[PDB]
Design an enzyme around this catalytic site. Structure first.
Site, PDB file in Angstrom:
ATOM      1  N   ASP A   1      81.177   9.074 -31.784  1.00 31.54           N
ATOM      2  CA  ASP A   1      82.404   8.747 -31.009  1.00 31.54           C
ATOM      3  C   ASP A   1      83.652   8.978 -31.879  1.00 31.54           C
ATOM      4  OD1 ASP A   1      82.369   7.947 -28.163  1.00 31.54           O
ATOM      5  OD2 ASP A   1      83.572   6.206 -28.805  1.00 31.54           O
TER       6      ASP A   1
ATOM      7  N   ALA B   1      83.718   3.411 -20.578  1.00 36.06           N
ATOM      8  CA  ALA B   1      84.803   4.406 -20.394  1.00 36.06           C
ATOM      9  C   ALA B   1      84.415   5.731 -21.067  1.00 36.06           C
ATOM     10  CB  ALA B   1      86.102   3.867 -20.945  1.00 36.06           C
ATOM     11  N   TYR B   2      83.782   5.658 -22.246  1.00 38.82           N
ATOM     12  CA  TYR B   2      83.282   6.813 -23.042  1.00 38.82           C
ATOM     13  C   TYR B   2      82.310   7.664 -22.210  1.00 38.82           C
ATOM     14  CZ  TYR B   2      79.025   3.996 -23.790  1.00 38.82           C
ATOM     15  OH  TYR B   2      77.882   3.269 -23.619  1.00 38.82           O
ATOM     16  N   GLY B   3      81.674   7.064 -21.196  1.00 39.21           N
ATOM     17  CA  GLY B   3      80.695   7.727 -20.312  1.00 39.21           C
ATOM     18  C   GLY B   3      79.419   6.918 -20.176  1.00 39.21           C
ATOM     19  N   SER B   4      78.335   7.590 -19.804  1.00 43.51           N
ATOM     20  CA  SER B   4      77.005   6.998 -19.534  1.00 43.51           C
ATOM     21  C   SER B   4      75.937   7.790 -20.295  1.00 43.51           C
ATOM     22  CB  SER B   4      76.732   6.959 -18.057  1.00 43.51           C
ATOM     23  OG  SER B   4      77.147   8.170 -17.439  1.00 43.51           O
TER      24      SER B   4
END
Ligand SMILES: C[S@](=O)c1ccc(-c2nc(-c3ccc(F)cc3)c(-c3ccncc3)[nH]2)cc1
Ligand SMILES: [Mg+2]
Ligand SMILES: [Mg+2]
Ligand SMILES: [Mg+2]
EC number: 2.7.11.24
Length: 337
Positions: free
Chosen positions: A165, A31-34
């Site tokens: 994060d 969800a945080y990204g790639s």
């Protein structure tokens, strides 16, 4: 001037990066990204490139995109992820829909530490030291992580550690933010560090709750039910009723719980894992604890420049946040190598 970008597909994701970044290889998704590992032909350094997922899907997402960029552009500390670079393939605000962030590559995290492991558990001292050194910096700028866990702490082959994060499972979560007794201060992150340190010394999750109720029960088993002075400070009547409805649990002797651990470690854990956030040790205080005698240097534990969080109270349209994010991308200046 704009550099030359090239396009490729990896794990059903389009990556459009400047040509200076070569040999993109997936290391992470969610969800945080790639995130891809890459090689930066300008510096000669191994980097991580993060592509944000659906950065402008909602006001919530667009504001979160802005918040991440503002936080990462602020951090200049050895124990906190720093921005080497930020870019978009977009040529103007009108077709701006993708944001890429670049930082020094870190091979691992605290879930998988082997290149640091030594018999005497002197590695625990160095890793927690670096976490506290990073939290002192973040806390000095009125930034609270709020969700610190082993997967958020990146580690090199050198066993150098960085927080990522930040400023944005339930096992590492402070009791007061899981429910909202006294609201919360910076020491919610010191609770999380306690749980992490505990796990590094024992090899088991200190408090592996299956749900919020089981989680609080596992916590009170160790730290004991709140005293008079703590009950007095709970402004939620729902919380205060629940705590008092449970049978009294005593505070346990930590020396017996963490049996055979370094007694300086046990003493620090006692100062970190207190229910009452007003009497929990701070990052600055924890750095001066005798457990870190070999590493502590008061002249090399820097604080942060002031950080403007006024945006947090603002209620804007997706397009206003998107334009504010675009401005932060354009105004970016890399650190002087
Ligand atoms: C919250 S979940 O546990 C989670 C774990 C890792 C990351 C995560 N985000 C990054 C990351 C990368 C580049 C950036 F510019 C910003 C963040 C990395 C990274 C950085 C350097 N080397 C390897 C990986 N890991 C995000 C979410
Ligand atoms: Mg608190
Ligand atoms: Mg444990
Ligand atoms: Mg502090």
């Amino acid at each position: 001037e704009r550099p030359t970008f090239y396009r490729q597909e990896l794990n059903k994701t389009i990556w459009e990066v400047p040509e200076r970044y070569q040999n993109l290889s997936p290391v992470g998704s969610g969800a945080y990204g790639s995130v891809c590992a890459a090689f930066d032909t300008k510096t000669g350094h191994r980097v991580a490139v993060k592509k944000l997922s659906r950065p402008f899907q909602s006001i919530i997402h667009a504001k979160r995109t802005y918040r991440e960029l503002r936080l990462l552009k602020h951090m200049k500390h050895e124990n906190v992820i720093g921005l080497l670079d930020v870019f978009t393939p977009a040529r103007s605000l009108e077709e701006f829909n993708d944001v890429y962030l670049v930082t020094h590559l870190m091979g691992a995290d605290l879930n998988n530490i082997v290149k640091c492991q030594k018999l005497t558990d002197d590695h625990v001292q160095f890793l927690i030291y670096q976490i506290l050194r990073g939290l002192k910096y973040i806390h000095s700028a009125d930034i609270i992580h709020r969700d610190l866990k082993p997967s958020n702490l990146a580690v090199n082959e050198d066993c150098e550690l960085k927080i990522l994060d930040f400023g944005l499972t339930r096992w590492y979560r402070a009791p007061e933010i899981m429910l909202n007794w006294m609201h919360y201060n910076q020491t919610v992150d010191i609770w999380s560090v306690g749980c992490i340190m505990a796990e590094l010394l024992t090899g088991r999750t200190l408090f592996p709750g299956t749900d919020h109720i089981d989680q609080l029960k596992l916590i009170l088993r160790l730290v004991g039910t709140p005293g008079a002075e703590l009950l007095k400070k709970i402004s939620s009547e729902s919380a205060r009723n629940y705590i008092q409805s449970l049978a009294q649990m005593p505070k346990m002797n930590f020396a017996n719980v963490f049996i055979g651990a370094n007694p300086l470690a046990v003493d620090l854990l006692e100062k970190m894992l207190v229910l009452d956030s007003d009497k929990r040790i701070t990052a600055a205080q924890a750095l001066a604890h005798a457990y870190f005698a070999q590493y502590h240097d008061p002249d090399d534990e820097p604080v942060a420049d002031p950080y403007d969080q006024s945006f947090e109270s603002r209620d804007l349209l997706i397009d206003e946040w998107k334009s504010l994010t675009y401005d932060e991308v354009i105004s970016f200046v890399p650190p002087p190598l």
